[PDB]
């Protein structure tokens, strides 16, 4: 006997991409070498963020970039390992340079229209191997329809599963004291 609580316990984080993209395999080899043989934590962070799934890589917008391009950050490099989407609300787009996994056609058009330049993760590794003068960004993880249904219960104010919406669907007993009780 040895008196252990856990044995042969596995890891909790991904160690290899589930996608079979060949170009993504090349990028993973490149950043695995950079992260192994570079002191910058930026390489380890980007390498891990390359592992993430689509629901763990939400899109970021031009408006969200312009939000973080203030208070002295107009000259830094924005790094987003995700898709980048144009925003219809923003009428004037400032001048910036962006390195992202992929861009939408209209977002790319407006970036090159304003006088910017669109990079690629390989060009980013070629120009700034250590990630100097950069800021990383993420999208809103919890801004998903499925998250509103999570953990439903009494006194939690979540969203229920209904096939339609109307006065005949739910409400009634348990939602007003006029019919029994409330939640």
């Amino acid at each position: 006997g040895i008196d252990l609580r856990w044995k042969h316990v596995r890891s909790s984080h991904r160690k290899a991409p589930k996608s079979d993209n060949v170009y993504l395999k090349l990028l993973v080899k490149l950043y695995r070498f950079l992260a192994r043989r570079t002191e910058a934590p930026f390489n380890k962070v980007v390498l891990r963020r390359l592992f993430m799934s689509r629901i763990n890589r939400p899109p970021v917008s031009l408006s969200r970039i312009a939000r973080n391009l203030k208070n002295g950050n107009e000259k830094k490099t924005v790094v987003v390992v995700a898709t980048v989407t144009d925003d219809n609300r923003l009428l004037q787009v400032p001048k910036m340079e962006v390195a992202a996994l992929r861009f939408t056609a209209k977002a790319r058009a407006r970036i090159e229209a304003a006088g910017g330049r669109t990079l690629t993760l390989d060009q980013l590794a070629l120009e700034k191997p250590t990630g100097a003068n950069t800021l990383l960004l993420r999208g809103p993880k919890n801004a998903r329809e499925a998250v509103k249904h999570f953990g439903f219960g009494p006194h939690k104010h979540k969203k229920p599963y209904v096939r339609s919406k109307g006065r005949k669907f739910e409400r009634a007993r348990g939602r007003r004291r006029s019919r029994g009780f409330k939640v």
């Binding site: 219809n88 609300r89 009428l91 004037q92 229209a113 439903f152 219960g153 009494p154 229920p160 599963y161 006065r167 005949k168 739910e170 409400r171 009634a172 007993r173 348990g174 939602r175 007003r176 019919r179 029994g180 939640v183």
Partner: protein, 148 residues
């Protein structure tokens, strides 16, 4: 594809993953929504609060065409004009000419106001218009007139 399914990993194992004492019989507990008030009450009140009862007045022979009025906010108002002219207006080369946007031709009836508007006069033709949207259009130099 049947080559990848869990029923093949159960070959050689008696009871096929359904248990020995509980033998996966035909229909234990009833069919469908049976027992809503008797033995499935805990599920139907922890989840789906509001299944039973009547609320509100009833309507005979509802025609949904009487209640058709899609709406568009004001921050997307400039998105209706084409890109080539929009960039000209935003850049500021006209200084003497204003566009008149017709919401009905694009399929909208009421103009709500949520965001901000640049200081360029416009004219909007809508079936309905909000009070705050009217105020913002007035402070932007424009005017809105009902068209029916």
């Amino acid at each position: 594809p049947t080559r990848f399914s869990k029923t093949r990993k159960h070959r050689g194992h008696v009871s096929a993953g359904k248990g020995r004492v509980g033998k996966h019989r035909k229909h234990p507990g009833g069919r469908g929504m049976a027992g809503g008030q008797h033995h499935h009450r805990t599920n139907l009140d922890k989840y789906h609060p509001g299944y039973f009862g009547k609320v509100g007045m009833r309507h005979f022979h509802l025609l949904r065409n009487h209640y058709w009025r899609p709406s568009i906010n004001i921050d997307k108002l400039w998105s209706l004009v084409p890109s080539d002219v929009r960039e000209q207006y935003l850049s500021g080369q006209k200084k003497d000419t204003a566009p008149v946007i017709d919401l009905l031709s694009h399929g909208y009836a009421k103009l709500l106001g949520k965001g901000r508007l640049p200081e360029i006069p416009v004219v909007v033709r809508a079936r309905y218009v909000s009070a705050e949207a009217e105020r913002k259009v007035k402070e932007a130099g424009g005017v809105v007139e009902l068209v029916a």
